[PDB]
Amino acid sequence: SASALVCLAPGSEETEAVTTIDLLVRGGIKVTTASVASDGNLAITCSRGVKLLADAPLVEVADGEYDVIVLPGGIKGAECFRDSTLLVETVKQFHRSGRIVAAICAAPATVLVPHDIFPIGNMTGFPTLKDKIPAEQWLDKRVVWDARVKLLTSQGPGTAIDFGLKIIDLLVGREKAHEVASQLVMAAGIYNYYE
């Protein structure tokens, strides 16, 4: 089965993280949540106060063979990711071993740009944090998939469905992405993978 490592830190955006996890599970992807920047503590207080329990500390799962690493946004959670040497090295290792990096909202600008992980990749993120993404790299689009570098980015809490569906499409295929989309009662405007 395909698998995903979803990272969580104090201040992660809970709608982004939880919507993504839920959709991936609906897609038949095995999801492990990892606590970042918590010295092993699994209880994570998210950006609006939602409290989640992660499965494991990052240091215990970072070398697993997951197909994708997912970085939720949330201002402070993304800062924790940026300032975690283990998180940054893990992202780099996923990329160099041919796997997918997926990041939403503040995570592209806060994590990927300062560490120069994808120096010429195309990416999006939260629109009013546009200035923090190099102008030549920026696209203002609900989801961006840069197939060349296997970088998936997305914009905000309201694009979390679009983000999760594209992960499903990439790891388990279009038909499964459509099946999941069909379970949700999605808003007009969001791509449902029927075509």
Added chain:
Amino acid sequence: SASALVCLAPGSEETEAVTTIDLLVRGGIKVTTASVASDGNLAITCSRGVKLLADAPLVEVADGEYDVIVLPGGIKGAECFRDSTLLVETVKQFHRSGRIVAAICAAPATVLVPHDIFPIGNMTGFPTLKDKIPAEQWLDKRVVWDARVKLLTSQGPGTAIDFGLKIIDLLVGREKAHEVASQLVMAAGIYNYYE
């Protein structure tokens, strides 16, 4: 000053619950989460495995001064709600005291219909459970607000933003609902409270 009691059970739909909580907090609404687990456990495993911590057992907060009681869906979470005499009594008390009941996905058909809490009024819910709503009550709308009985219902994980925004409208007003919506990068098919 407005406040919301968001109920949680084993098997609740985590995207519905968490998206709603996040939006209400963004709207300046005080949120308390209440576990309806039969043993009072607060560490809830949701329908796709997300582990969410409730603030309090329902018995400790049911008599509180909340403007709305929120029932997330999730097949098994809604069954837990239906089968909890305290939950059902609390919903009835919110309604009889002139407060709002808000329910999404399976919660209308599983909780509200069998207990006949709203014998008259329009409601929606998850479309595969349409035949579990009395035909004279059913509408196929992303959100249904029946002000005559102060009943707010909605359809599924993908309508959680619409649902949360309508709670904001009902507790705080259109201006705040538009403010919150404007934060989210939400899809064009979701009403944004701007005219």
